[PDB]
């Protein structure tokens, strides 16, 4: 799998918070449209012991209300393993979750 | 906080796999209904170096079809910090994510 989503119960501006987490991780943001609270990242590397199985992904990240609350969404656009494209369901769901995990950890601090 | 969801692009039986990951973690499953693909966990403690700040949560976990794919959902039912109930947004979302991450990692390798 391919989209992860998370409900955030803040009572507002979750979008600038998510953007700030990504800036703080120094991810390159290749497309960003604040009016639609959506962005696309350049490749993010998932550093791991085994380079011959290091993964990298690109994502579309957004915030949408799901009234009364807001939801953060992470959509895995492309995935590579040691620089070769991959599309296996196990890796796709893991690497969607790994970007969600970055955003969630960032939002707690 | 509250609910986390993840699309898994398999196809089928994602539900028995999710169950197997939790059994592997030795989590206690207090309620389970396979026909409805849902279960409730006992408290799950999230280990931290500072024990007076340690959280535990209880979760409703389920799988449902979403279009042609399957969605895993984690709902954080209750959260406590060093035994005290807590409801702050920032904690709730992180400890919803912590359980999703356990399930995800389990579905990846095994």
Query: In this structure, what DSSP letter does residue A49 have?
Result: S
CA angle A99, A101, A105 (to 5 degrees): 125
CA-to-CA distance for A96 and B6, rounded, in angstroms?
8
> For residue A56, what are the domain limits?
1-109
CB contact under 8 A, B10 and A100: no
Q: Three-state SS for B64? A: strand
Residue A28 half-sphere exposure toward CB, CA atoms < 13 A: 7
Tokens representing B35 are 């026909």
Contact call for B93 and A105, based on CB within 8 A: no
Tell the residue number behind the tokens 């702050």, with chain if given. Answer: B88
Experimental method: X-ray
| Beta pairing partners, A55 | A46, A81
Report the alpha-carbon distance of residue A108 to residue B99 in Å, rounded: 15
How far is Cα A73 from Cα A53, in angstroms, rounded to an integer? 26
**B86 neighbourhood in chain A, CB within 8 Å:** none
- What angle is formed at CA A78 by the lines to CA A96 and CA B74, rounded to 5 degrees? 15
Paired with B28 in beta bridges are: none
Q: What angle do CA B106, A83, A74 make, to 5 degrees?
A: 50
Q: Is any Cβ of chain A less than 8 angstroms from the Cβ of B17?
A: no
Dist. CA B91–CA B102, nearest whole Å: 17
Q: Do A108 and B96 touch (CB under 8 A)?
A: no
CATH code: domain of residue B33: 3.30.530.50
Count CB-CB contacts under 10 A for residue A2. 19
Whether A1 and B2 lie within 8 Å, measured CB to CB:
no
Q: How many domains does one find in chain B? A: 1
CB B68 within 8 A of CB B11: yes
CB pair distance less than 8 Å for B8 and A101: no
Nearest CB to B94 within list A11, A93, A104: A104
CA distance B33 to B12: 18
CB atoms under 10 Å from CB of B49, counted, come to: 6
CA dihedral A108, B70, A70, B56 (to 10 degrees): -30
Cβ-contact B15, B5 below 8 angstroms: no
Task: State how far residue B14 is from chain A, nearest Cα, in angstroms.
Answer: 11
Experimental structure resolution, Å? 1.5
3-state helix, strand, coil in chain A (%, to 5): 30, 40, 30
Residues 59-88 of B with CB under 8 A from A: 69-70
Pairing of strands B3-8, B29-33: unpaired
Beta bridge partners of B76: B59
Helix, coil or strand: residue B54: coil
The terminus-to-terminus CA distance of chain B in angstroms comes to: 29
A8 touches B at CB < 8 Å: yes
Instruction: State the Cα–Cα distance between residues A13 and A9, nearest whole angstrom.
Output: 11
């Amino acid at each position: 799998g391919d989209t992860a989503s998370l409900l955030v119960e803040n009572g507002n501006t979750l979008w600038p918070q998510v953007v700030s987490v990504l800036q703080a991780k120094n991810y390159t943001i290749t497309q960003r449209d604040d009016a639609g609270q959506t962005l696309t990242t350049d490749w993010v590397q998932w550093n791991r012991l085994d380079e011959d199985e290091q993964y990298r992904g690109r994502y579309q990240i957004s915030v949408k209300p799901q009234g009364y609350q807001q939801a953060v969404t992470v959509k895995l656009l492309n995935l590579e393993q040691a620089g070769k494209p991959v599309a296996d369901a196990a890796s796709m769901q893991r690497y969607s979750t790994e970007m969600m995990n970055v955003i969630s950890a960032g939002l707690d601090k």
